[PDB]
Amino acid sequence: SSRVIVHVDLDCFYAQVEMISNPELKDKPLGVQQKYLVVTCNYEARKLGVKKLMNVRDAKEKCPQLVLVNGEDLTRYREMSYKVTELLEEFSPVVERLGFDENFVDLTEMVEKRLQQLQSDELSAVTVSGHVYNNQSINLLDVLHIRLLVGSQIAAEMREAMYNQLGLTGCAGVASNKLLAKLVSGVFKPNQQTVLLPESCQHLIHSLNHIKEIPGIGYKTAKCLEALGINSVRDLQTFSPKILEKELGISVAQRIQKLSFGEDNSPVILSGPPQSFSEEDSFKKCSSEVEAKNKIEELLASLLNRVCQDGRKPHTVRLIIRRYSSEKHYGRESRQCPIPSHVIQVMTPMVDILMKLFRNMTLLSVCFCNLK
Amino acid sequence: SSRVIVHVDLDCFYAQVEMISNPELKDKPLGVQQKYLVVTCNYEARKLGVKKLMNVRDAKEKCPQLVLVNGEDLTRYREMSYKVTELLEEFSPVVERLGFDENFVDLTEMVEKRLQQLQSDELSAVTVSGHVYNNQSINLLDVLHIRLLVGSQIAAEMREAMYNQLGLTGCAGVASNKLLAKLVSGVFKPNQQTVLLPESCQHLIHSLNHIKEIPGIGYKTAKCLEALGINSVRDLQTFSPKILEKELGISVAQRIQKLSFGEDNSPVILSGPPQSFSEEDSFKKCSSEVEAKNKIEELLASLLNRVCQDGRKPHTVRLIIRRYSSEKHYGRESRQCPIPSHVIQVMTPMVDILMKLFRNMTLLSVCFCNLK
DNA sequence: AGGACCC
DNA sequence: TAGGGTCCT
DNA sequence: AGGACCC
DNA sequence: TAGGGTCCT
Ligand SMILES: Nc1ccn([C@H]2C[C@H](O)[C@@H](COP(=O)(O)OP(=O)(O)OP(=O)(O)O)O2)c(=O)n1
Ligand SMILES: Nc1ccn([C@H]2C[C@H](O)[C@@H](COP(=O)(O)OP(=O)(O)OP(=O)(O)O)O2)c(=O)n1
Ligand SMILES: [Mg+2]
Ligand SMILES: [Mg+2]
Ligand SMILES: [Mg+2]
Ligand SMILES: [Mg+2]
């Protein structure tokens, strides 16, 4: 039944990687730019009002002294992101990734094995490592407190190792499920860790200011919950299970309502190798509709290099697009087809499929999937 | 590279099972009825003009002395169909099912292991078991002939065992890929077997009278191939790879054209346990739209009994429908939702999901999928 | 194919 | 206003 | 969700 | 004109 889960969430991930590559960017406010977006910035920059995902413009008139490096090519972020995951897999094999810089790890077996190693005595010497959310008092006779503390120690070891082995700093959150571990990992933001004891669960959940902040409720469900009067986490908690049930479906409803309480049973799943490999190119206005094929070969050349290296081969290929007038707020199109078996065991053939796949049809991408 | 594949295809499967249950139906022309459809009939009935999938009416004015048993409930056909597959898995583990009464088995490893058991002498005594398609002469110095013959013998053993162990008769086809093995299994129809030597491949493929007859080309691609002038297997063979490529997609095109030649690389896949469990009920006009919920509980009661017995549990549930005016030639609708985790470890809850799933929405069905 | 959600 | 990624319907 | 194909 | 089933987009 009761779990100890850690969420590890690195500091300003892309910026960190670029500050390690070029030390002269440390102590300078640094943004990482992709097109006209400053996708992230180091903490010197955020002191100056730069926020995650500003446009460049907004960001250099909040802070004109900002250095920008291009981060369009994710290769090095991707590589560091797998080094991180593989280090954490060493502590416990079941690591779930979320984007390039978050991992969840179910520490439940590891905590219990450390607890049985202690003799009935040093158990009163168990302390916490890091902060305790809401400054809550620990009760060393509460078996759950104890386990969560041991879980804070495992966390501190994982962060130390990330630092010593890969040069990376990060936050960690320790709690009894993934939702709470992830909410509590951000309470002390820069390169620290927090542990949630069960008595403070409602305080954390109610510290949120809109239901969008609950992992699991996105841009669309939020706009829905509103249209009904449901604005705070408490409105969602107290709202009618029925009317909700019959509006968002039985699945989305009964789940998001659980979450509004801090309750989340989802297991930490082994992410292992990726299920897809894609790259992309943005260029607003530039795809005449054929001129831009030389674009399709570029995407291919990288992708083949990557897909290769893994071992596994993809058995499906896909092509994706969008097109331009006023804000069509969601609108990409794709054509999918198997990859013929003779080609699986090079470029030149891969480029055709992708053109014809372009004919059954701002910006362009290729995706390899269905790996084996 | 070169394979020996067998396709096993049982005689009038449902009728066989009902003639074994009630011996008094043997030697009588027997049809198995589902609603107004005689889905299949034993060979005494087909002498009298009864064909597979006639309406009852048509079928009893071609042969008014026809006995009919109801076959709406597939339980016993399903059970016999897994006994068959599991027997064939005993000869070689990789057995692919197709519907309830066809299996493919890749005999390639088994043939080669029997060949290395023979000393360089009794290899000239290898004979065939069953017919040889097109009455083709065997060449005992042709390693491919030899292997195919040994493959005919394995086939005869599998059919004998099916008979001795389960009481069932069937045809088998032996050839170098699945397409050809399946085409050649029907040449000698009632309870016999045929083997295809490579020199006669084109004769078999050209013996077909319309491209619909090629496994792989269905009701829709056929209507397409027509709209273009492609009517015979030879028209498909000689038609332009390009114009085809750019009309049915690169995938459907390059594959169906291979097939038109007798070429088919698809591997025999291990079907193992099912990926879904459903039942259905037809009743044309009867679903007022709620009255008919008592229908939804009936489907559930069986399904739960089955899903159970396997071991594995389903994590998804689905509900399916159609509705009625003139011939909407395809038109079923479904609502899917996860099954909550507390319910996975009974009826009563399963009935609700399925109603609400009915509200987001002739005939009705429930499907359990996503087993684990 | 496309939707919805995440970083 | 990027460039990726996951699983569900 | 629905399409297409198979028995 | 049944009652099932598989995998792809
Ligand atoms: N919409 C998004 C979200 C994030 N990222 C990228 C840039 C980030 O460096 C990285 C990790 O996302 P985080 O929300 O973790 O942001 P940071 O690690 O950069 O900031 P923090 O220190 O607040 O955790 O993924 C992105 O490209 N697009
Ligand atoms: N459209 C279909 C096709 C078949 N079946 C069922 C009834 C059959 O008994 C069984 C196997 O299908 P076959 O084409 O193999 O038909 P038979 O085994 O009945 O006839 P045969 O002796 O020609 O192989 O599946 C069905 O219900 N609906
Ligand atoms: Mg993060
Ligand atoms: Mg981060
Ligand atoms: Mg058959
Ligand atoms: Mg049959």
Side-chain angles (χ1 to χ4, degrees), chain A residues 1-120 122-219 221-245 247-289 292-312 314-323 331-341 343-345 347-352 354-355 357-362 364-372, chain B residues 1-120 122-219 221-245 247-289 292-312 314-323 331-341 343-345 347-352 354-355 357-362 364-372:
Chain A
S1 201
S2 221
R3 299 182 292 147
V4 184
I5 303 307
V6 68
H7 182 231
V8 182
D9 187 334
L10 270 34
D11 308 315
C12 56
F13 187 49
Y14 285 6
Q16 257 186 100
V17 174
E18 294 298 341
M19 295 164 84
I20 289 168
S21 280
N22 189 330
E24 285 139 44
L25 308 156
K26 293 230 282 191
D27 54 280
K28 289 169 210 174
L30 172 59
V32 176
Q33 191 173 188
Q34 291 180 318
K35 289 308 183 308
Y36 311 91
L37 232 200
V38 183
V39 66
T40 182
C41 56
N42 60 3
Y43 279 76
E44 232 46 278
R46 304 173 194 201
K47 280 183 194 164
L48 292 89
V50 192
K51 290 302 170 64
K52 289 185 286 187
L53 316 161
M54 236 146 241
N55 357 280
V56 132
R57 263 161 69 201
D58 290 24
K60 259 157 22 186
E61 91 166 77
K62 225 95 187 135
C63 162
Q65 45 142 145
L66 187 60
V67 187
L68 287 167
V69 313
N70 193 270
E72 274 163 28
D73 178 5
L74 294 200
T75 300
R76 309 190 307 189
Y77 310 147
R78 178 201 295 122
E79 286 175 354
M80 194 68 26
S81 183
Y82 279 100
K83 290 190 185 190
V84 179
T85 297
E86 280 175 36
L87 193 184
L88 296 179
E89 283 168 317
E90 213 189 299
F91 286 79
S92 161
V94 177
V95 177
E96 189 178 336
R97 311 174 110 231
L98 219 201
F100 284 7
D101 90 320
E102 295 179 35
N103 297 265
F104 291 101
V105 191
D106 184 325
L107 297 183
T108 303
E109 274 180 31
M110 210 179 143
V111 164
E112 253 288 324
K113 158 196 191 204
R114 297 190 169 197
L115 280 178
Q116 291 154 18
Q117 252 33 239
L118 303 182
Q119 47 150 304
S120 3
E122 34 187 26
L123 188 127
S124 325
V126 166
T127 54
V128 72
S129 173
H131 298 265
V132 178
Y133 180 72
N134 196 33
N135 189 46
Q136 194 190 317
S137 282
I138 288 155
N139 182 337
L140 301 166
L141 300 187
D142 188 317
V143 63
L144 294 173
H145 287 23
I146 293 298
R147 292 158 126 244
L148 295 164
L149 295 192
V150 170
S152 76
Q153 288 157 32
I154 305 312
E157 291 163 25
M158 295 172 155
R159 292 198 302 117
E160 247 309 327
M162 279 177 285
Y163 187 67
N164 285 331
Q165 300 191 21
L166 303 177
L168 292 168
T169 63
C171 296
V174 174
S176 77
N177 63 223
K178 294 203 278 165
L179 199 205
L180 268 6
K182 172 167 188 175
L183 292 176
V184 83
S185 57
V187 174
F188 292 96
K189 273 278 277 206
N191 151 36
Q192 285 172 78
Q193 71 188 64
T194 307
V195 60
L196 178 66
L197 307 182
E199 294 75 9
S200 290
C201 172
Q202 286 313 299
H203 183 291
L204 208 209
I205 205 77
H206 286 295
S207 62
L208 302 184
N209 289 307
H210 206 292
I211 40 173
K212 212 267 199 184
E213 287 163 19
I214 284 162
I217 302 172
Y219 173 56
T221 34
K223 285 308 164 195
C224 311
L225 278 150
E226 282 185 58
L228 305 91
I230 298 165
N231 294 305
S232 59
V233 174
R234 197 172 313 272
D235 285 339
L236 168 53
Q237 286 182 172
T238 50
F239 195 87
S240 169
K242 300 271 194 189
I243 307 166
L244 202 62
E245 228 170 292
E247 183 99 46
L248 296 176
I250 191 150
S251 168
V252 171
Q254 188 181 143
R255 178 182 32 86
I256 62 170
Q257 193 161 88
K258 282 307 282 273
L259 292 184
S260 87
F261 286 93
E263 278 148 35
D264 168 27
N265 72 28
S266 61
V268 174
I269 285 319
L270 207 192
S271 288
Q275 308 296 298
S276 50
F277 289 90
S278 75
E279 331 216 319
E280 209 161 294
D281 201 30
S282 216
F283 46 39
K284 313 288 223 31
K285 307 193 169 156
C286 296
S287 145
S288 111
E289 268 140 277
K293 122 159 205 193
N294 230 63
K295 315 318 220 116
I296 289 186
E297 322 198 327
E298 289 244 340
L299 297 170
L300 261 53
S302 299
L303 285 173
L304 271 58
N305 212 298
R306 302 222 265 132
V307 144
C308 191
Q309 281 252 182
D310 166 60
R312 307 143 52 235
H315 283 194
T316 305
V317 86
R318 179 198 317 224
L319 269 112
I320 303 168
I321 71 155
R322 113 278 256 205
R323 349 156 112 153
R332 359 163 82 67
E333 283 161 40
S334 38
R335 292 328 166 153
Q336 201 189 296
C337 97
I339 292 187
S341 53
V343 344
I344 290 176
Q345 313 193 74
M347 249 247 55
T348 50
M350 265 324 124
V351 189
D352 229 15
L354 293 221
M355 304 330 292
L357 272 141
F358 193 45
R359 278 119 217 195
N360 194 243
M361 291 253 260
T362 95
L364 288 228
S365 74
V366 180
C367 177
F368 289 89
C369 57
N370 198 258
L371 297 285
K372 302 205 180 185
Chain B
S1 201
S2 221
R3 299 182 292 147
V4 184
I5 303 307
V6 68
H7 182 231
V8 182
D9 187 334
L10 270 34
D11 308 315
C12 56
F13 187 49
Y14 285 6
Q16 257 186 100
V17 174
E18 294 298 341
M19 295 164 84
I20 289 168
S21 280
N22 189 330
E24 285 139 44
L25 308 156
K26 293 230 282 191
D27 54 280
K28 289 169 210 174
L30 172 59
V32 176
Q33 191 174 188
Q34 291 180 318
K35 289 308 183 308
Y36 311 91
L37 232 200
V38 183
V39 66
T40 182
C41 56
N42 60 3
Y43 279 76
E44 232 46 278
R46 304 173 194 201
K47 280 183 194 164
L48 292 89
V50 192
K51 290 302 170 64
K52 289 185 286 187
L53 316 161
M54 236 146 241
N55 357 280
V56 132
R57 263 161 69 201
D58 290 24
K60 259 157 22 186
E61 91 166 77
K62 225 95 187 135
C63 162
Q65 45 141 145
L66 187 60
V67 187
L68 287 167
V69 313
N70 193 270
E72 274 163 28
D73 178 5
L74 294 200
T75 299
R76 309 190 307 189
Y77 310 147
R78 178 201 295 122
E79 286 175 354
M80 194 68 26
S81 183
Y82 279 100
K83 290 190 185 190
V84 179
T85 297
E86 280 175 36
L87 193 184
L88 296 179
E89 283 168 317
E90 213 189 299
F91 286 79
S92 161
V94 177
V95 177
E96 189 178 336
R97 311 174 110 231
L98 219 201
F100 284 7
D101 90 320
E102 295 179 35
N103 297 265
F104 291 101
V105 191
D106 184 325
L107 297 183
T108 303
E109 274 180 31
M110 210 179 143
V111 164
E112 253 288 324
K113 158 196 191 204
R114 297 190 169 197
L115 280 178
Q116 291 154 18
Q117 252 33 239
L118 303 182
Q119 47 150 304
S120 3
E122 34 187 26
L123 188 127
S124 325
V126 166
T127 54
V128 72
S129 173
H131 298 265
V132 178
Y133 180 72
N134 196 33
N135 189 46
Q136 194 190 317
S137 282
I138 288 155
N139 182 337
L140 301 166
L141 300 187
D142 188 317
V143 63
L144 294 173
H145 287 23
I146 293 298
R147 292 158 126 244
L148 295 164
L149 295 192
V150 170
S152 76
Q153 288 157 32
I154 305 312
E157 291 163 25
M158 295 172 155
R159 292 198 302 117
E160 247 309 327
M162 279 177 285
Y163 187 67
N164 285 331
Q165 300 191 21
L166 303 177
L168 292 168
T169 63
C171 296
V174 174
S176 77
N177 63 223
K178 294 203 278 165
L179 199 205
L180 268 6
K182 172 167 188 175
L183 292 176
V184 83
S185 57
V187 174
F188 292 95
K189 273 278 277 206
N191 151 36
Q192 285 172 78
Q193 71 188 64
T194 307
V195 60
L196 178 66
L197 307 182
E199 294 75 9
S200 290
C201 172
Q202 286 313 299
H203 183 291
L204 208 209
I205 205 76
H206 286 295
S207 62
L208 302 184
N209 289 307
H210 206 292
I211 40 173
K212 212 267 199 184
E213 287 163 19
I214 284 162
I217 302 172
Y219 173 56
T221 34
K223 285 308 164 195
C224 311
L225 278 150
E226 282 185 58
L228 305 91
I230 298 165
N231 294 305
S232 59
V233 174
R234 197 172 313 272
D235 285 339
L236 168 53
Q237 286 182 172
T238 50
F239 195 87
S240 169
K242 300 271 194 189
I243 307 166
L244 202 62
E245 228 170 292
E247 183 99 46
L248 296 176
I250 191 150
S251 168
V252 171
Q254 188 181 143
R255 178 182 32 86
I256 62 170
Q257 193 161 88
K258 282 307 282 273
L259 292 184
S260 87
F261 286 93
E263 278 148 35
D264 168 27
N265 72 28
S266 61
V268 174
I269 285 319
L270 207 192
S271 288
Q275 308 296 298
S276 50
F277 289 90
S278 75
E279 331 216 319
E280 209 161 294
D281 201 30
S282 216
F283 46 39
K284 313 288 223 31
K285 307 193 169 156
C286 296
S287 145
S288 111
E289 268 140 277
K293 122 159 205 193
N294 230 63
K295 315 318 220 116
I296 289 186
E297 322 198 327
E298 289 244 340
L299 297 170
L300 261 53
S302 299
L303 285 173
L304 271 58
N305 212 298
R306 302 222 265 132
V307 144
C308 191
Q309 281 252 182
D310 166 60
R312 307 143 52 235
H315 283 194
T316 305
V317 86
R318 179 198 317 224
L319 269 112
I320 303 168
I321 71 155
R322 113 278 256 205
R323 349 156 112 153
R332 359 163 82 67
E333 283 161 40
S334 38
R335 292 328 166 153
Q336 201 189 296
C337 97
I339 292 187
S341 53
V343 344
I344 290 176
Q345 313 193 74
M347 249 247 55
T348 50
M350 265 324 124
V351 189
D352 229 15
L354 293 221
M355 304 330 292
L357 272 141
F358 193 45
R359 278 119 217 195
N360 194 243
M361 291 253 260
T362 95
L364 288 228
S365 74
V366 180
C367 177
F368 289 89
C369 57
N370 198 258
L371 297 285
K372 302 205 180 185

